[PDB]
Curated annotation (Swiss-Prot), chain A:
This is Na(+)-translocating NADH-quinone reductase subunit F. The keyword Transmembrane helix applies. It comes from the Bacteria. The gene is nqrF. GO terms for molecular function: 2 iron, 2 sulfur cluster binding; electron transfer activity; FAD binding; metal ion binding; oxidoreductase activity, acting on NAD(P)H, quinone or similar compound as acceptor. It comes from Vibrio cholerae serotype O1 (strain ATCC 39541 / Classical Ogawa 395 / O395). Residues 130-270 form the FAD-binding FR-type domain. Gene3D superfamilies: 3.10.20.30, Nucleotide-binding domain of ferredoxin-NADP reductase (FNR) module (3.40.50.80), Translation factors (2.40.30.10). Composed of six subunits; NqrA, NqrB, NqrC, NqrD, NqrE and NqrF. Signal peptide: none annotated. It is a single-pass membrane protein.
Curated annotation (Swiss-Prot), chain B:
It comes from the Bacteria. NQR complex catalyzes the reduction of ubiquinone-1 to ubiquinol by two successive reactions, coupled with the transport of Na(+) ions from the cytoplasm to the periplasm. NqrA to NqrE are probably involved in the second step, the conversion of ubisemiquinone to ubiquinol. Belongs to the NqrA family. It catalyses: a ubiquinone + n Na(+)(in) + NADH + H(+) = a ubiquinol + n Na(+)(out) + NAD(+). NCBIfam families: nqrA (TIGR01936), PRK05352.1-2 (NF003759). This is Na(+)-translocating NADH-quinone reductase subunit A.
From Swiss-Prot, chain C:
One of its GO terms (cellular component) is Gram-negative-bacterium-type cell wall. Its EC number is 7.2.1.1. The chain crosses the membrane at residues 11-31, 39-59, 77-97, 110-130, 140-160, 176-196. Belongs to the NqrDE/RnfAE family. This is Na(+)-translocating NADH-quinone reductase subunit E. It is a multi-pass membrane protein. It comes from Vibrio cholerae serotype O1 (strain ATCC 39541 / Classical Ogawa 395 / O395). One of its GO terms (molecular function) is oxidoreductase activity, acting on NAD(P)H, quinone or similar compound as acceptor. NCBIfam families: nqrE (TIGR01940).
From Swiss-Prot, chain E:
NQR complex catalyzes the reduction of ubiquinone-1 to ubiquinol by two successive reactions, coupled with the transport of Na(+) ions from the cytoplasm to the periplasm. NqrA to NqrE are probably involved in the second step, the conversion of ubisemiquinone to ubiquinol. It is found in: Cell inner membrane. Its cofactor is riboflavin; FMN. The chain crosses the membrane at residues 22-39, 55-75, 128-148, 163-183, 274-294, 296-316, 324-344, 357-377, 380-400. Signal peptide: none annotated. Changing W225L: Decreases riboflavin content. It catalyses: a ubiquinone + n Na(+)(in) + NADH + H(+) = a ubiquinol + n Na(+)(out) + NAD(+). The modification FMN phosphoryl threonine is found at T235. This is Na(+)-translocating NADH-quinone reductase subunit B. GO terms for molecular function: FMN binding; oxidoreductase activity, acting on NAD(P)H, quinone or similar compound as acceptor; riboflavin binding. Keywords: Cell inner membrane, Cell membrane, Flavoprotein, FMN, Ion transport, Membrane, NAD, Phosphoprotein, Sodium, Sodium transport, Translocase, Transmembrane, Transmembrane helix, Transport, Ubiquinone. It comes from Vibrio cholerae serotype O1 (strain ATCC 39541 / Classical Ogawa 395 / O395).
Length: 408, 446, 198, 251, 412, 204
């Protein structure tokens, strides 16, 4: 027992000496003081956060909302801030989301920035105009087999200032839903009972946000109209959980309430004075209605326009009366739709097949200059990639092709 | 002076007699759309429209303001479009004598012209396309400006014409063009020439420089490397002597001067000589009756760097000042790779040909081997005089590394700068395309 | 004069820590893509080894050696804990002090300190020093030489992997397989100093 | 309640870990020492000709037969001490009890020799059968240690064993080949004039020779090590005076 | 009519045919006899005459004098050592016990002392040709297998690889060991990196290092360098180490080894490495043509001479290898073989003219170092070249980093 | 579940995919005895460290987490070293300095930090066992090949008769030297990513 006591005492004293040395070193060698963040010039009013923390979290701390999609981490890659003086570096998500796109001015993804030193940023005013709301559902009904028109009423009579093509983000809390509470009419009950779709159920236990595209042009006030497509399990593996957000929205009915974030922005129309060609499909009728209406109603422009929507039947087509209410008096607007395989109850007398074979054959095949036009498209992954292939084989530049991926 | 010691003067038969003789009357010209790098046309005419000299044919989307006009009057006969609907040529059939006229000046007014006036007249006449910026060898923007403007008063290409023989017929237009180019720059104008004397200008910033040696030396790339090294923050403009004559004539008479003097030479040409011709003329009519019976290849430019002119490409390029013709070599020979070749040219010393000095070869379009991997035996170092590491740079181009290539010196180069490295490669690599891909990636990323 | 020259040359060439002793191969194989990062990591390794081996020699000879503190007591089972504690503490205090006082040197090397804060290279260095029972000057020279040899090996591997941009490796061997084969060939190369008794 | 908490946590964890470690380390020292001694005991019993398996028989036969002794190299007679725990490897390092050999004396390239060495007497009843001497020398890659059993007459060899070496597995690591080691049975170390006369012959040795052992095939440089270590340790700076005296008697 | 035959069946081997699997074997056999007959595609309408086939065949033809002298010398040393030991009816039983000997006597030769140059070259051929055939077949198998599975065409270089590996080995090497060595050299050192032009080591030297460390007794010692049954003799770099220049003696004959004997090549050793004169005759031809690098050769010579003279100056009384001058290092062992044909490998060397000097200097210095201060190995050429093959890229890095600084100053 | 204990064997291998623990795999695989002993030791130490760090995950000060984790790991490997010297002395000497290098073995601290600090005590034990098993897979395979080919015996039991002792097999020398482990591990990675093309790395 002469050596055991020595061993215990020496182990304890050595570990204690090492710990105390490290604490004494850190006590004098790590800064910890006042750290400011001065943005968009310098009205000295700034965000004073302590040196420990993260940038976009420090920004969001005081009424400044940047576009985030997965709570943080770097999946989407739209948290782009101007860094005039701060951390000078590039981090793994910068290589994947702001890939090379050389930024000499300095525009790094805010997620990866370190707030330890002092920060000097530049943030455009369009970030400062975003707001949260509490809206109530006016109606929720099918316009196609798996598309629903979620209309919300912005309170106070105040309305959202946005531009055609922008997107809100929808907030939903922890909850439970089941499919047998849905308002699917009798016109659309066929396919649901055929795959036994009503058996599915879901529940999420955390907060979630997914982005949705407004389907009304800005001059329509006090309303945010959205077209949602419910994301059920794919037919190959129907065991996996269904979509948790898209299923939540279908549960809502008139008299509920929903909460939304301010106007985010991308995929805007240009003013080149060129011909505009719109190709929509699926739940992509939302950005196309905002684009076609913003031009004919508010801007009153005389650019040559066109719209080509690709459905799967006549039952799948919606907004058909509104568009003909536009083309009838505005003679510089024309629109066509093309059913893939119409059921014999349709008796369709127009076009068939996919839209890239209907757009090319009827219109682009005999066109004087296909490259001079502007192409705005928004649809499923199968339609998006099939058209962009066709447009490139016609000599069109990726600067004339505006695409709106739905992030999936 | 500057003396180039690393290079190669190609021994090839059919060198021309430097005497300017008249040429056939051309019946159709064309604008080759695929020689302007990064150019996406916006067509202003359709098939069947009649046009005038210096009337816009198309425009550039990626470069706003730049106009592409017609070399002659006449009438559009055809527009050739190829894979993925790309523009190949806009062919005009010569007719009528209508043109567009501009302002005229005197020879003493030219040095005091305004730079924006000069720019507007050049862009309107469509003579702005004669310029090219290093790096990326593109047509300059309408708002940009350069400190170094290089005049190519020499040519060391194989079977090429001597500039002085042509400049001594247009001395005064050459001087007027040099004065306009002295007024158009914010720095200096470098007239890169050989030892012989040329018509000279009395302006301060215009200055002459002399180069001697084999051919890497008649290229604007070596001139820039040795007088005004280029980078991303320094850009130089390049032009040749015939375009300077064109500028002088435009500013001296108010009309466009669309003539050329090309050299019709090659191992199969019956009478190689200097031929007067029009810009963008038809090579299949220019070489009519001046070739030997057999299967030949017609080229617009050098055999080191040119454009095989067949079908919709059988027209003289914009930056080309000669036509080369040579046979097509499709013969197979027993153990030809192992035979002692007395009539075989090489940079190495493996064959018996180098033992006979002064021998000229009847070369053809044969690839003397198959495509293999790069084994460096030191041939690239023998034919490149610039201060670079050719093997490492060419392996960076082969592998597809753009960032390393830029550090190794890709931004100084052009396709004409690696034509000789492509020439002497045992693995039969083509380095012009690899460097164009590297420069495309660079210009896109930034 | 010459007893420390043979030790340095031996530690650098005759017994290379990366290639002959197989110490620190995870960072050696993972962080050898660019010569710049390899140079930085090698300099950091040199510094940490040169600072760490003499301190542990001193601590061992003062407290942990048999009969060093009191007669009849052997406290030499604490070698592992003492050495690893000293190494970790020194690395952490180093990155702190360079981060606070020399931001240039910190962005130069202190970025490569979080990797070698617990490394088989340094632990094996101090362990072989214990085995061989060096003096203070011999510990300094051995640490410096072994760090320099490790740096040389890693910079050579990085140069080879930069030259290999023109290679065409089968897809199953892209990365780890071809790096292991490259390191094996480098070991065949360094097997030249086998029979040298220095 | 923050630094207090940190110090309390680290102190408690250190107490638990140190108790466990210092209890495990001190409790097993005796078993570790026996595990260290048994391998050398077994090797000596093997070279002595005695067959034994298991710790039981190893310890029994070693304690009953082998009697270690301390021998002073310069004088060549026994010196008192605790020979069972003497450590010649470490005694050679300390300059208090070592010497530095001249470049002419250092035939085996060991550079240092302890003052006293330990030998093992094999006893049969109360009489001495033979003596086992530890010798070592330098080969091409390593220092090779050996055991050699000399008979009572002081010349005849009854066995040999190389219990440590690092030479190439099938070129010079054949000093551990039993067919090679069995060539030493019967060879005479000294001649009539009492000279060192063991010879490792290159290219085969004549059958019947008393001083000749075959060399290693393709390892003349690990065969030189054996020859040098033997002509050194059989010299006057090694076991020469001791072997002369035991030849006179006194065993 | 060989030309028309190869043209009719070409459709069978291009995509869509029944024999599309054997395209790489048809292309390698079609392009051997006849040239492809191809024309340029783009923008460089005339090409040089040189290709990889001539670059490889000029190196393959350059080692023919060394190969023939090696066969002659192998046979001569074998016959002399045989007649040294046996005579009478016990030499006949030796000759009838070895097929290398009774085949030599059956084809017309003789094993007696008075055998001419024809009987010696025949025995040397009986020793050399099986090794070369085994190496060629086994290595070509792996080469064609890789090029087939990866769907490529067969690059050139294996002619040189195989002939060099077959001439740097002892005359008494077992055939299965040669097979394993050529397997390791081709597959592990070359083919796994992508083929010709894409590796970083020397494949022939990598295969010989595999055999030296794996089976070290068939490539070392005194029983492998004179193909005589029962004869044991030492070479001259392992006789200088044990006694100096006074120990250079030919035991089979009892004659001293002069300097001319080592230059001409009347000494035992690896098959083709013995004749410095023949090696020079070939190296001058391939250095004139511009294939081999006189910068690398000059660097190797500079390093060897400098380190040799330094060792000669500082001196030592125990190590007899300090006395060896520079003109003895040149003619003994395989220094000339490695300096002329194995260090000048374009792919394994440096790519810069200022890095080639350092590459050669490192090779020479390491060779003399392993020769002198390493007790275990009698030479060091395969290990000094393998060692410099790793640092060849580092010299190019230094040079090109110095080049990049000149460009940023706007002077380059 | 068995998922966590059997995935690191082929799906997520420490040495083959997550590179960790190469220093001991290159060194101890000359003998299948030493390979088995090191596998058992690594299993034991990683499992116990995961268990204890997961127990104390809540009260660790974040300023000195590394000192606490290294204290636990070093105590464990010290008692392992003491146990080895008392009951397996033959193998303990063969393991020259790699018994104490289980401290700086990367799998131990990797599993302790990445998984033990965030999980319950019981799952961390199975995680450590699974990582030890995945390590031992490569260890035992490389040791099998090297020991069978380089010396003709397995576990010290003669399987191929050596020519020196009167047999037919001549053993290979490289298998007992440094470079052969690199080649064996590289070819094993080749074979693994041949059957499971999920793990093939990107084009560049
Ligand atoms: C600017 C913008 C505008 C948008 N506008 C619209 C719009 O107007 N309408 C619209 O509907 N969407 C729109 N989106 C898309 C939106 O972000 C969501 O993708 C959509 O609302 C459905 O989300 P979700 O919650 O169902 O996704 P999730 O719930 O994350 O996934 C749903 C689907 O994934 C499957 N899935 C879940 N887990 C797995 C797994 N482990 N493996 C395989 N499959 C799995 C489910 O079975 C289901 O089919 C827009 C996106 C952006 C960026
Ligand atoms: C040769 C033949 C009929 C078929 C190949 C089948 C075979 C077993 C050969 C393996 C050796 C090999 C791959 C050599 C490549 C190579 C070829 C084919 N022709 C060459 C031609 C000239 C110079 C070098 C090479 C060269 O180096
Ligand atoms: C001068 C010259 C020397 C060569 N030396 C070798 C050699 O030593 N070993 C070898 O395997 N191939 C050699 N080769 C062939 C070729 O370079 C070899 O396959 C490449 O090293 C493989 O990429 C040589 C080729 C040339 C032209
Ligand atoms: S959420 Fe992906 S970047 Fe912030
Ligand atoms: S095990 Fe390789 S670094 Fe610790
Ligand atoms: Ca000793």
């Amino acid at each position: 027992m002469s050596t055991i006591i020595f061993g215990v005492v020496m182990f304890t004293l050595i570990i204690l000496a090492l710990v105390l040395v490290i604490l004494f070193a850190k006590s004098k060698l790590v800064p910890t003081g006042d750290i400011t963040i001065s943005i968009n010039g310098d009205p000295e009013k700034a965000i004073v956060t302590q040196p420990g923390g993260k940038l976009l979290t420090a920004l969001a701390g005081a009424g400044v909302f940047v576009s985030s999609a997965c709570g943080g981490g770097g999946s989407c890659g739209q948290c782009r801030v101007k860094i005039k003086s701060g951390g000078g570096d590039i981090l793994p998500t910068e290589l994947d989301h702001i890939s090379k796109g050389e930024a000499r001015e300095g525009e790094r993804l805010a997620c990866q920035v370190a707030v330890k030193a002092d920060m000097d940023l530049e943030l455009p005013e369009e970030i400062f105009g975003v707001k949260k709301w509490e809206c109530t559902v006016i109606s929720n009904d099918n316009k196609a087999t798996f598309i629903k028109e979620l209309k919300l009423a912005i309170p106070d009579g105040e309305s959202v200032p946005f531009r055609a093509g922008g997107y809100i983000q929808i907030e939903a809390p922890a909850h439970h839903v089941k499919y047998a509470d849905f308002d699917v009419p009798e016109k659309y009950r066929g396919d649901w009972d055929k795959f036994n779709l009503f058996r599915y159920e879901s529940k999420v236990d955390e907060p979630i946000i997914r982005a949705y595209s407004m389907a009304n042009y800005p001059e329509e006030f006090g309303i945010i109209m959205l077209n949602v497509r419910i994301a059920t399990p794919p037919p190959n593996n129907p065991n996996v959980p269904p979509g948790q957000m898209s299923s939540y929205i279908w549960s809502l009915k008139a008299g509920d309430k929903c909460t939304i974030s301010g106007p985010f922005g991308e995929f805007f129309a240009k003013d080149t004075d060129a011909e505009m060609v719109f190709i929509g499909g699926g739940a992509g009728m939302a950005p196309m209605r905002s684009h076609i209406f913003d031009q004919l109603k508010r801007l009153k422009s005389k650019r040559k326009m066109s719209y080509w929507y690709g459905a799967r039947s006549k039952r799948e087509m919606f907004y058909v009366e509104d568009f003909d209410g536009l083309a009838a008096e505005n003679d510089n607007f024309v629109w066509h739709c093309a059913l893939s395989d119409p059921q014999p109850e349709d008796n369709w007398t127009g076009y068939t097949g996919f839209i890239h074979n209907v757009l090319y054959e009827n219109y682009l095949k005999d066109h004087e200059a296909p490259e001079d036009c502007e192409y705005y498209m928004c649809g499923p992954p199968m339609m998006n990639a099939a058209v962009i292939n066709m447009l490139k084989n016609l000599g069109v530049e990726e600067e004339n092709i505006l695409l709106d991926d739905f992030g999936g | 002076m500057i003396t180039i010691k690393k290079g190669l003067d190609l021994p090839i038969a059919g060198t021309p007699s430097q005497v300017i003789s008249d040429g056939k009357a051309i019946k159709k010209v064309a604008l080759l759309g695929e020689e302007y790098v990064g150019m996406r046309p916006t067509m202003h005419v359709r098939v069947g429209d009649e046009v005038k000299k210096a009337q816009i044919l198309f425009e550039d989307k990626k470069n706003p303001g730049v106009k592409f006009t017609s070399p002659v009057s006449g009438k559009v006969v055809e527009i050739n479009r190829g894979a993925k609907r790309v523009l190949q040529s806009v062919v005009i059939e010569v007719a009528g004598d209508d043109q567009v006229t501009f302002d005229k000046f005197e020879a003493n007014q030219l040095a005091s012209l305004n730079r924006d006036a000069i720019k507007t007249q050049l862009v309107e006449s469509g003579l702005w396309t004669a310029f090219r910026t290093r790096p990326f060898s593109k047509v300059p923007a309408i708002d940009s400006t350069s400190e170094a403007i290089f005049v190519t008063a020499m040519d060391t290409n194989p079977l090429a014409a001597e500039p002085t023989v042509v400049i001594n017929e247009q001395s005064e237009a050459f001087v007027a063009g040099l004065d306009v180019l002295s007024a158009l720059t914010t720095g200096k104008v470098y007239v890169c020439k050989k030892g012989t004397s040329l018509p000279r200008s009395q302006q301060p910033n215009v200055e002459e420089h002399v180069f001697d040696g084999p051919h890497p030396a008649g290229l604007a790339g070596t001139h820039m490397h040795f007088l005004y090294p280029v980078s991303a923050d320094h850009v130089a403009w390049s032009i040749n002597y015939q375009d300077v004559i064109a500028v002088g004539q435009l500013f001296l008479t108010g009309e466009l001067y669309t003539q050329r003097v090309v050299s019709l030479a090659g191992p199969v040409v019956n009478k190689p000589r200097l031929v007067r011709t029009v810009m963008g003329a038809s090579l299949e009519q220019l070489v009519d009756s001046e070739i030997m019976p057999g299967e030949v290849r017609i080229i617009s430019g050098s055999v080191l760097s040119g454009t095989k002119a067949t079908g919709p490409h059988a027209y003289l390029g914009r930056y080309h000042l000669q036509v080369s013709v040579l046979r097509e070599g499709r013969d197979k020979e027993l153990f030809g790779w192992a035979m002692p070749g007395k009539n075989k040219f090489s940079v190495t010393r493996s064959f018996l040909g180098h033992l006979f000095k002064g021998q000229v070869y009847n070369m053809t379009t044969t690839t003397n081997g198959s495509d293999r991997s790069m084994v460096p035996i030191g041939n690239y170092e023998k034919v490149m005089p610039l201060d670079m590491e050719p093997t490492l740079l060419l392996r960076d181009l082969c592998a597809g590394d753009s960032d390393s290539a830029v550090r190794l010196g890709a931004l100084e180069l052009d396709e004409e700068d690696l034509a000789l490295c492509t020439f002497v490669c045992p693995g039969k690599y083509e380095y012009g395309q690899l460097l164009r891909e590297c420069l495309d990636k660079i210009e896109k990323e930034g | 004069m010459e007893h420390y020259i043979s030790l340095l040359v031996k530690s650098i060439f005759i017994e290379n820590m990366a290639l002959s002793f197989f110490l620190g191969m995870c960072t050696f194989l993972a962080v050898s893509k660019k010569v710049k990062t390899s140079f930085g990591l090698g300099i950091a390794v040199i510094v940490v080894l040169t600072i760490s081996v003499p301190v542990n020699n001193l601590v061992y000879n003062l407290v942990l050696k048999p009969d060093a503190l009191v007669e009849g007591v052997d406290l030499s089972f604490l070698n592992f804990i003492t050495f690893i504690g000293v190494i970790a503490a020194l690395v952490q205090i180093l990155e702190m002090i360079l981060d606070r006082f020399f931001p240039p040197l910190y962005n130069a090397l202190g970025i490569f300190l979080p990797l070698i804060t617990v490394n088989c290279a340094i632990f094996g260095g101090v362990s072989f020093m214990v085995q061989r029972d060096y003096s203070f000057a011999e510990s300094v020279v051995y640490g410096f030489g072994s760090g320099v040899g490790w740096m040389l090996a890693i910079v050579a591997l990085a140069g080879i992997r930069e030259k290999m941009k023109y290679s065409d490796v089968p897809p199953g061997l892209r990365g780890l397989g071809i790096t292991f084969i490259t390191a094996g060939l480098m070991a065949l190369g360094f097997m030249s100093f086998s029979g040298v008794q220095l | 309640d923050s630094i207090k908490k940190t110090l309390f946590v680290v102190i408690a964890l250190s107490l638990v870990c140190s108790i466990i470690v210092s209890a495990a380390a001190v409790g097993l020292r005796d078993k570790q020492k026996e595990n260290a001694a048994l391998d050398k005991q077994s090797k000596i019993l093997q070279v002595a000709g005695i067959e034994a398996k298991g710790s039981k028989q190893i310890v029994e036969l070693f304690n009953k037969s082998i009697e270690p002794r301390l021998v002073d190299f310069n004088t060549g007679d026994f010196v008192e001490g605790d020979a069972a725990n003497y450590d010649q490897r470490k005694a050679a390092k300390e300059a208090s009890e070592s010497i530095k050999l001249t470049a002419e004396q250092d035939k085996a390239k060991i550079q240092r020799r302890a003052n006293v060495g330990v030998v093992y007497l094999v006893k049969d009843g109360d009489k001495t059968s033979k003596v086992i001497l530890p010798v070592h020398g330098n080969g091409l890659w390593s220092m090779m240690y050996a055991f050699v059993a000399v008979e009572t007459d002081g010349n005849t060899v009854s066995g040999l064993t190389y219990y440590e070496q690092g030479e190439t597995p099938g070129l010079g690591g054949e000093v551990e080949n039993p067919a090679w080691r069995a060539q030493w049975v019967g060879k005479k170390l000294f001649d009539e004039n009492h000279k060192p006369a063991i010879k490792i012959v290159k290219g085969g040795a004549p059958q019947g020779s008393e001083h000749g052992v075959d060399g290693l095939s393709g390892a003349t440089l690990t065969s030189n090590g054996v020859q040098n270590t033997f002509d050194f340790w059989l010299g006057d700076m090694g076991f020469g005076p001791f072997l002369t005296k035991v030849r006179d008697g006194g065993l | 009519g060989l030309k028309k035959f190869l043209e009719d069946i070409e459709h069978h081997f291009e995509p869509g045919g029944k024999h599309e699997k054997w395209f790489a074997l048809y292309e390698a056999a079609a392009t051997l006899f006849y040239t492809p007959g191809l024309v340029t595609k783009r923008s460089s309408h005339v090409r040089d005459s040189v290709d990889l086939k001539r670059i490889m065949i000029m190196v393959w033809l350059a080692v023919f004098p060394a190969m023939f002298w090696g066969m002659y010398n192998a046979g001569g040393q074998a016959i002399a050592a045989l007649n040294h030991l046996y005579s009478g009816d016990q030499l006949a039983a030796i000759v009838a016990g070895n097929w290398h000997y009774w085949l030599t006597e059956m084809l017309g030769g003789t094993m007696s002392s008075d055998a001419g140059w024809g009987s010696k070259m025949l025995l040397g051929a009986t020793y050399f040709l099986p090794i070369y055939a085994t190496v060629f077949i086994v290595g070509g198998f792996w080469e064609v297998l890789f090029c087939m599975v990866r769907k490529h065409e067969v690059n050139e270089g294996f002619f040189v690889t195989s002939i060099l590996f077959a001439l740097i080995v002892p005359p008494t090497l077992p055939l299965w060991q040669a097979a394993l060595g050529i397997t390791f050299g081709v597959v592990v050192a070359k083919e796994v990196f992508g083929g010709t032009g894409r590796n970083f080591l020397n494949p022939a030297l990598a295969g010989r290092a595999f055999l030296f460390f794996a089976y070290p007794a068939q490539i070392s010692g005194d029983l492998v360098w004179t193909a005589a049954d029962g004869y044991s003799g030492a070479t001259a770099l392992s006789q200088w180490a044990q006694g100096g220049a006074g120990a250079l003696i030919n035991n089979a004959t009892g004659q001293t080894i002069t300097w001319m004997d080592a230059f001409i090549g009347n000494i035992p050793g690896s098959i083709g490495e013995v004749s410095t004169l023949a090696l020079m005759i070939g190296a001058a031809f391939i250095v004139y043509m511009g294939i081999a690098s006189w910068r690398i050769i000059g660097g190797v010579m500079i390093g060897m001479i400098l380190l040799s003279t330094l060792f000669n100056v500082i001196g030592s009384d125990t190590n007899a290898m300090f006395n060896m001058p520079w003109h003895w290092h040149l003619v003994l062992g395989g220094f000339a073989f490695g300096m002329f044909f194995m260090a000048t490998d374009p792919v394994s060397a440096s790519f810069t003219n200022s890095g080639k000097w350092a590459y050669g200097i490192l090779i020479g210095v390491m060779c003399v170092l392993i020769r002198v201060v390493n007790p275990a190995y009698p030479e060091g050429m395969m290990l000094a070249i393998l060692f410099a093959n790793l640092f060849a890229p580092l010299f190019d890095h230094v040079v090109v980093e110095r080049n990049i600084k000149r460009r940023l100053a706007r002077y380059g | 579940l068995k998922k966590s204990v059997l995935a690191p064997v082929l799906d997520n291998n420490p040495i083959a995919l997550q590179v960790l623990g190469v220093c001991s795999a290159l060194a101890v695989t000359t003998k299948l005895e030493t390979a088995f002993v090191m596998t058992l030791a690594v299993m034991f130490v990683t499992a116990l460290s995961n268990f204890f760090v997961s127990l104390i995950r809540n009260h660790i000060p974040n300023s000195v987490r590394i000192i606490v984790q290294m204290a636990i790991i070093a105590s464990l490997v010290i008692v392992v070293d003491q146990i080895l010297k008392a009951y397996l002395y033959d193998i303990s000497k063969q393991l020259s300095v790699f018994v104490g290098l289980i401290i700086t073995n990367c799998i131990v601290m990797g599993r302790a930090e990445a998984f033990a600090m965030k999980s319950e005590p019981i799952p961390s034990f199975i995680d450590g066992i699974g990582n030890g098993l995945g390590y031992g897979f490569v260890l035992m395979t490389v040791g099998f090949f090297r020991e069978l080919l380089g010396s003709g015996k397995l576990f010290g039991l003669e399987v191929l008769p050596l020519i020196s002792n009167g047999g037919w097999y001549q053993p290979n020398g490289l298998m007992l030297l440094a470079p052969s482990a690199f080649f064996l591990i590289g070819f094993m990675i080749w074979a693994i990513r041949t059957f499971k093309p999920e793990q093939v790395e990107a084009k560049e």
